[PDB]
Protein backbone atom coordinates (compact mmCIF):
# COMPACT_ATOMS: atom_id res chain seq x y z
CA UNK A 318 1.94 -3.20 -0.84
CA UNK A 319 0.00 0.00 0.00
CA UNK A 320 1.00 3.68 -0.38
CA UNK A 321 1.93 4.29 3.28
CA UNK A 322 4.63 1.57 3.23
CA UNK A 323 6.24 2.86 0.02
CA UNK A 324 5.99 6.52 1.24
CA UNK A 325 7.85 5.52 4.43
CA UNK A 326 10.62 3.87 2.30
CA UNK A 327 10.90 6.96 0.06
CA UNK A 328 10.95 9.36 3.06
CA UNK A 329 13.52 7.20 4.92
CA UNK A 330 15.78 7.26 1.85
CA UNK A 331 15.58 11.08 1.57
CA UNK A 332 16.35 11.42 5.30
CA UNK A 333 19.36 9.10 4.77
CA UNK A 334 20.70 11.27 1.85
CA UNK A 335 20.03 14.50 3.76
CA UNK A 336 21.80 13.05 6.89
CA UNK A 337 18.74 13.60 9.06
CA UNK A 338 17.53 10.08 10.06
CA UNK A 339 14.47 10.27 12.31
CA UNK A 340 15.51 9.91 15.97
CA UNK A 341 13.78 6.91 17.58
CA UNK A 342 13.61 3.15 16.95
CA UNK A 343 15.07 3.66 13.43
CA UNK A 344 14.31 2.35 9.95
CA UNK A 345 13.01 -1.18 9.21
CA UNK A 346 15.17 -4.06 7.87
CA UNK A 347 13.72 -3.38 4.37
CA UNK A 348 14.52 0.32 4.58
CA UNK A 349 18.08 -0.37 5.86
CA UNK A 350 18.73 -2.79 2.94
CA UNK A 351 17.30 -0.35 0.39
CA UNK A 352 19.37 2.61 1.76
CA UNK A 353 22.57 0.68 1.25
CA UNK A 354 21.81 -0.55 -2.33
CA UNK A 355 20.16 2.66 -3.55
CA UNK A 356 23.07 4.81 -2.26
CA UNK A 357 25.59 2.63 -4.16
CA UNK A 358 23.54 3.11 -7.36
CA UNK A 359 23.09 6.86 -6.66
CA UNK A 360 26.88 7.41 -6.40
CA UNK A 361 27.43 5.71 -9.77
CA UNK A 362 24.60 7.67 -11.47
CA UNK A 363 25.96 11.02 -10.08
CA UNK A 364 29.40 10.18 -11.48
CA UNK A 365 27.95 9.08 -14.89
CA UNK A 366 25.66 12.13 -15.10
CA UNK A 367 28.16 14.73 -13.75
CA UNK A 368 28.00 17.18 -16.73
CA UNK A 369 24.16 16.84 -16.97
CA UNK A 370 23.73 17.45 -13.21
CA UNK A 371 26.04 20.49 -13.18
CA UNK A 372 23.72 22.37 -15.62
CA UNK A 373 20.32 21.47 -14.09
CA UNK A 374 18.35 23.94 -11.89
CA UNK A 375 16.04 22.10 -9.50
CA UNK A 376 14.45 25.26 -8.13
CA UNK A 377 11.13 23.89 -6.91
CA UNK A 378 9.12 20.76 -6.10
CA UNK A 379 7.18 21.27 -9.38
CA UNK A 380 10.46 21.28 -11.39
CA UNK A 381 11.74 18.24 -9.44
CA UNK A 382 8.48 16.44 -10.35
CA UNK A 383 8.84 17.34 -14.06
CA UNK A 384 12.49 16.13 -14.15
CA UNK A 385 11.61 12.97 -12.23
CA UNK A 386 8.78 12.15 -14.71
CA UNK A 387 11.17 12.69 -17.66
CA UNK A 388 13.86 10.34 -16.30
CA UNK A 389 11.19 7.76 -15.37
CA UNK A 390 9.83 7.79 -18.95
CA UNK A 391 13.33 6.97 -20.29
CA UNK A 392 14.02 4.38 -17.55
CA UNK A 393 10.83 2.33 -18.24
CA UNK A 394 10.30 2.94 -21.99
CA UNK A 395 10.68 -0.77 -22.94
CA UNK A 396 7.85 -1.63 -20.48
CA UNK A 397 9.93 -4.06 -18.39
CA UNK A 398 10.16 -3.82 -14.58
CA UNK A 399 12.86 -5.43 -12.46
CA UNK A 400 14.33 -4.77 -9.00
CA UNK A 401 17.39 -2.85 -10.31
CA UNK A 402 15.07 -0.40 -12.05
CA UNK A 403 13.08 0.09 -8.85
CA UNK A 404 16.34 0.85 -6.91
CA UNK A 405 17.15 3.43 -9.62
CA UNK A 406 13.89 5.27 -8.76
CA UNK A 407 15.22 5.82 -5.22
CA UNK A 408 18.66 6.86 -6.54
CA UNK A 409 16.98 9.55 -8.67
CA UNK A 410 14.89 10.91 -5.78
CA UNK A 411 18.18 11.11 -3.75
CA UNK A 412 19.81 13.17 -6.55
CA UNK A 413 16.74 15.43 -6.82
CA UNK A 414 16.64 16.13 -3.03
CA UNK A 415 20.39 17.02 -3.02
CA UNK A 416 19.85 19.47 -5.89
CA UNK A 417 16.73 20.99 -4.29
CA UNK A 418 18.70 21.47 -1.00
CA UNK A 419 21.19 23.58 -2.98
CA UNK A 420 18.97 25.33 -5.56
CA UNK A 421 15.37 25.57 -4.21
CA UNK A 422 14.02 29.17 -4.33
CA UNK A 423 12.63 30.08 -0.86
CA UNK A 424 13.79 26.73 0.58
CA UNK A 425 11.29 24.80 2.64
CA UNK A 426 12.69 22.22 4.98
CA UNK A 427 9.69 19.86 4.60
CA UNK A 428 10.30 19.56 0.81
CA UNK A 429 11.57 15.95 1.13
CA UNK A 430 8.05 15.05 2.20
CA UNK A 431 6.61 16.28 -1.14
CA UNK A 432 9.34 14.63 -3.21
CA UNK A 433 8.76 11.31 -1.24
CA UNK A 434 5.06 11.65 -2.01
CA UNK A 435 5.38 11.88 -5.80
CA UNK A 436 8.06 9.11 -5.82
CA UNK A 437 5.68 6.83 -3.85
CA UNK A 438 2.80 7.73 -6.20
CA UNK A 439 4.98 6.77 -9.18
CA UNK A 440 6.12 3.48 -7.56
CA UNK A 441 2.62 2.54 -6.52
CA UNK A 442 0.88 3.38 -9.78
CA UNK A 443 3.49 2.15 -12.24
CA UNK A 444 5.30 -0.73 -10.47
CA UNK A 445 2.94 -1.69 -7.60
CA UNK A 446 1.34 -4.71 -9.33
CA UNK A 447 4.77 -6.09 -10.37
CA UNK A 448 6.15 -5.62 -6.86
CA UNK A 449 3.26 -7.56 -5.16
CA UNK A 450 3.52 -10.35 -7.80
CA UNK A 451 7.27 -10.63 -7.05
CA UNK A 452 6.98 -10.90 -3.25
CA UNK A 453 6.65 -7.26 -2.22
CA UNK A 454 9.42 -5.57 -0.27
CA UNK A 455 9.74 -8.21 2.44
CA UNK A 456 9.61 -11.38 0.32
CA UNK A 457 10.96 -9.93 -2.94
CA UNK A 458 13.21 -6.93 -2.60
CA UNK A 459 14.84 -7.84 0.74
CA UNK A 460 15.36 -11.47 -0.32
CA UNK A 461 17.20 -10.34 -3.47
CA UNK A 462 19.31 -7.56 -1.96
CA UNK A 463 19.92 -8.46 1.73
CA UNK A 464 23.48 -9.31 2.73
CA UNK A 465 24.63 -12.73 1.94
Ligand SMILES: *CCC(=O)N(c1ccc(O[C@@H]2CC[C@@H](N)C2)cc1)[C@@H](C)c1ccc(Cl)cc1
Nearest residue numbers: 366369370373384385387388391392409412413
Ligand atom coordinates in the same frame (compact mmCIF):
# COMPACT_ATOMS: atom_id res chain seq x y z
C1 LIG B 1 21.03 16.44 -18.30
C2 LIG B 1 19.82 15.79 -18.84
C3 LIG B 1 18.62 16.14 -18.01
O1 LIG B 1 18.38 17.31 -17.73
N1 LIG B 1 17.85 15.12 -17.52
C4 LIG B 1 18.21 13.74 -17.69
C5 LIG B 1 17.74 13.03 -18.79
C6 LIG B 1 17.96 11.66 -18.89
C7 LIG B 1 18.65 11.00 -17.88
O2 LIG B 1 18.66 9.64 -18.06
C8 LIG B 1 19.36 8.80 -17.10
C9 LIG B 1 20.43 8.18 -17.96
C10 LIG B 1 19.62 7.22 -18.84
C11 LIG B 1 18.58 6.62 -17.90
N2 LIG B 1 19.00 5.27 -17.42
C12 LIG B 1 18.46 7.62 -16.73
C13 LIG B 1 19.13 11.70 -16.79
C14 LIG B 1 18.91 13.07 -16.69
C15 LIG B 1 16.66 15.48 -16.70
C16 LIG B 1 15.37 14.89 -17.27
C17 LIG B 1 16.95 15.25 -15.23
C18 LIG B 1 18.07 15.83 -14.66
C19 LIG B 1 18.43 15.57 -13.35
C20 LIG B 1 17.65 14.73 -12.60
CL1 LIG B 1 18.19 14.26 -11.02
C21 LIG B 1 16.52 14.14 -13.13
C22 LIG B 1 16.18 14.41 -14.44
